[PDB]
């Protein structure tokens, strides 16, 4: 479909290591990335400016996909929040577009962050998936300083077929996910 870097490392290096490590019988048993979802939980743009599209153009830039809106489920008073208010962005990366984002993340994003000292090991799902948080977003290379108004974080979730954290730990560690402890 498209020859890419990280997909090669998975298929030509990560795969076999996993097999010899847990002794998978069948081929599809071998754990693999299903999808990567980015979610900028804004709501800072609630009643406020529709200039969440600045964060949206910034988003589509990083991912190469157009981001969708997320709106208020229930209204909450303590949050100054009306049910239906636009309060976030979410974009779902699958197949090749996933592989590209992950390559630029493990290689260029994650190092360029202030005082990187490893990903949290305990942050594993319990049924094979993994979650992390960024606060910057100029951290991605295609975002120069001039494009930014104010900072903005995002919620990355990465989903694998791994039955458990162990298998998941390995699939990620082997790809290039640097862990802290």
């Amino acid at each position: 479909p498209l020859d890419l870097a990280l997909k090669r490392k998975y298929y030509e290096e990560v795969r076999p290591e996993l097999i010899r490590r847990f002794g998978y019988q069948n081929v599809w048993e071998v754990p693999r990335l299903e999808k990567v979802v980015i979610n900028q939980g804004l709501g800072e743009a609630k009643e406020d400016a529709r200039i969440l599209e600045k964060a949206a153009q910034e988003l589509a830039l990083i991912t190469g996909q157009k981001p969708a809106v997320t709106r208020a489920k229930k209204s909450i008073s303590n949050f100054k929040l009306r049910k239906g208010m636009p309060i976030g962005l979410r974009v779902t990366l699958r197949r090749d577009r996933m592989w590209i984002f992950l390559e630029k993340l493990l290689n260029v994003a994650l190092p360029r962050i202030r005082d990187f000292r490893g990903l949290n090991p305990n942050s594993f799902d319990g049924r094979g998936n993994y979650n992390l948080g960024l606060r910057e977003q100029l951290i991605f290379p295609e975002i120069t300083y001039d494009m930014v108004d104010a900072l903005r974080g995002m919620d990355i979730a990465v989903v694998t077929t791994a039955e458990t954290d162990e298998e998941a730990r390995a699939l990620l560690e082997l790809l290039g996910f640097p862990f802290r402890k």
């Binding site: 360029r112 962050i113 202030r114 005082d115 910057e136 100029l138 951290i139 300083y145």
Partner: protein, 117 residues
Amino acid sequence: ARIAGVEIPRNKRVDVALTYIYGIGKARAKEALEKTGINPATRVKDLTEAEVVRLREYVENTWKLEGELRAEVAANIKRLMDIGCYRGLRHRRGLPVRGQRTRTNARTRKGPRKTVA
């Protein structure tokens, strides 16, 4: 994010723009420039990446800076509070460490004035 992790001000001279890191002062600025033959009066924008890459890879390695620095400073203070030295007690109360008068002033160590009837 450029050096060491946070983008120093462009458009302003090198000797100056260096200072804007948690670890560098005018002293290390005056110096670090010389040890890579950087023009001391050249603006950050004027810097060729030839000059940049050399002064980037220099300073990151040469000194403890920023977060790692601050965490080390913070870890330094924690040590005082645990053993129970006088300076450790003075950090526990938030009071002046370096041996001072507290009858007047000392307000930087204990913030806003807290008047009582």
